[PDB]
Amino acid sequence: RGKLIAVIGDEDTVTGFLLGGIGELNKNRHPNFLVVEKDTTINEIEDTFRQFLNRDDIGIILINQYIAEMVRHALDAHQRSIPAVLEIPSKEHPYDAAKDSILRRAKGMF
């Protein structure tokens, strides 16, 4: 009931989670997810990112790292805890490690 998990990522990432049973339409026919394609621009990602951050029914957001870099300024601008944003490796992009939001919050972590 309480909170949904929003996903902003590539075609396979979103498809996988949707099969995972996560994601749904609100009463306004809005989807708590975005598929980011090669033709998707920065304003589209940022607008979606912001709407999830300002949407009180979301909370955890799952994004691809390569996207995290594309709109990275928005990831440090918001410092809260409901909107926990987790950065994941895309099907082909390589495993994340550096530029983790948390490793930045705490500079004492491997």
């Binding site: 075609e11 996988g16 949707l18 099969l19 995972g20 049973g21 749904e24 994941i88 994340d96 939001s101």
Partner: protein, 104 residues
């Protein structure tokens, strides 16, 4: 504990990504149907309180609400691979929920 979980997340997501490729191999192009055919969520997250000390910390807890997900045998009827794929990501989500709670 945050880093140990992050490392596991890598291994778990890799397996799910491969499993998706396997489902695609059999099914072909199911991704369009899944993305368009979305209505209700089966997984939702509830807030819970963790009394770490005098300070109380907000944590997420996985809630298996139970509303049925889409059952799709339309593409090559590759139900076995899609079923394993659902489970692989479902497991990934639970780990990610734990992961978000750790960020707080």
């Amino acid at each position: 504990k945050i880093i140990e979980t992050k490392m596991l997340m890598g291994e778990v997501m890799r397996e799910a990504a491969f499993s998706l490729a396997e489902a695609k191999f059999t099914a072909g192009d199911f991704s369009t149907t899944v993305i368009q055919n979305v209505n209700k969520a089966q997984v939702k997250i509830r807030a819970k309180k963790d009394n770490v000390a005098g300070v109380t910390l907000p944590v997420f807890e996985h809630y298996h609400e139970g509303t049925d997900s889409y059952e799709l045998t339309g593409l090559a009827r590759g139900g076995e691979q899609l079923a394993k794929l659902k489970r692989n990501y479902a497991k990934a989500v639970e780990l990610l929920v734990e992961l978000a709670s750790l960020q707080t």
